[PDB]
Amino acid sequence: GYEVHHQKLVGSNKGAIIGLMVGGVVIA
Amino acid sequence: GYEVHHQKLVGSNKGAIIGLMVGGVVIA
Amino acid sequence: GYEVHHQKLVGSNKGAIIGLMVGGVVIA
Amino acid sequence: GYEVHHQKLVGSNKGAIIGLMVGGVVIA
Amino acid sequence: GYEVHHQKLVGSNKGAIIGLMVGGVVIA
Amino acid sequence: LVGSNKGAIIGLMVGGVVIA
Amino acid sequence: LVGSNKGAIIGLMVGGVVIA
Amino acid sequence: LVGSNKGAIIGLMVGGVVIA
Amino acid sequence: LVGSNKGAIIGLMVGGVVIA
Amino acid sequence: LVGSNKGAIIGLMVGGVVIA
């Protein structure tokens, strides 16, 4: 179980690159 | 189980690149 | 089970590129 | 099962490119 | 079990690059 | 196979994306 | 096969996307 | 196989992404 | 195999990403 | 195998990322 809230991320970025992935949450 | 809320992300970005993927949530 | 709400993403981006995909949610 | 609500995404973007896909939800 | 809230991240960054991944939450 | 590759070569493909 | 590739080459294809 | 590769070469592919 | 590789070579691939 | 490798060579791959 996981919870994540009220946060922020700011500025230009190189993205997300991901392999074989099962059941994850990816914000990128 | 997962929960994610009220957050933000700001600025120009290189996106998301993803392999074989099962049941994930991807915001990008 | 998953929940995601009230969030935002801002700025021009290179999109999402995805391999073989089963049952996922992709916002991009 | 999945739930996603009350969010937004803002700015011009390069879309979504997806391989073989089964039962997914793609907003792009 | 995990909880993360009210935080921020600021400045241009090299993204996230990820191997085989099961059930994680990735902000990037 | 003889001679150089600068692009992508695949024997069998199921799903996936190739950008030259 | 003999001689150079700059694009994409596939033996068997199911689904997927190619951009030259 | 003879001669140099600067790109990508795959025997069997399920999912995944290739950028030259 | 004969001659130098500067790119990527894979026998069997499930998922994953290749950038030349 | 003959000649030097400056890139990446893999027998079997599940997940992972390769940057040349």
How would you sum up this structure, described in words?
The structure is a homodecamer. With 28 residues, chain A is mainly β. Chain A is 0% helix and 50% strand. Chain A contains no helices and five strands. Chain A has strands at 2-5, 8-10, 16-18, 21-22, 25-26. Chain A is flat, with a radius of gyration of 12 Å. The interface between A and B is medium-sized, with 28 and 28 residues.
Radius of gyration of chain A: 12 Å
Helix tally of chain A equals: 0
- Which sheet architecture does the biggest sheet of chain A show? none
Oligomeric assembly = homodecamer
Distance between the termini of chain A: 20 Å
Structural class of chain A: mainly beta
Largest interface: chains, residues each: A-B, 28 and 28 residues
Number of strands of chain A: 5
State which percent range the strand residues of chain A make up: over 45%
Helix content class of chain A: under 10%
Principal-axis shape of chain A: flat
What's the SSE pattern of chain A?
EEEEE
PDB class: protein fibril
Keywords: Amyloid Fibril, protein fibril
Assembly: decameric
Entry title: Cryo-EM Structure of Amyloid-beta Fibrils Carrying the Uppsala AbetaUpp(1-42)delta(19-24) Mutation - Polymorph 3
SSE layout and pairings?
The structure is a homodecamer.
Chain A: E1 2-5, E2 8-10, E3 16-18, E4 21-22, E5 25-26
Tags for this model:
homodecamer, 28 residues, mainly beta, 5 strands, Amyloid-beta protein 42 (chains A, B, C, D, E)
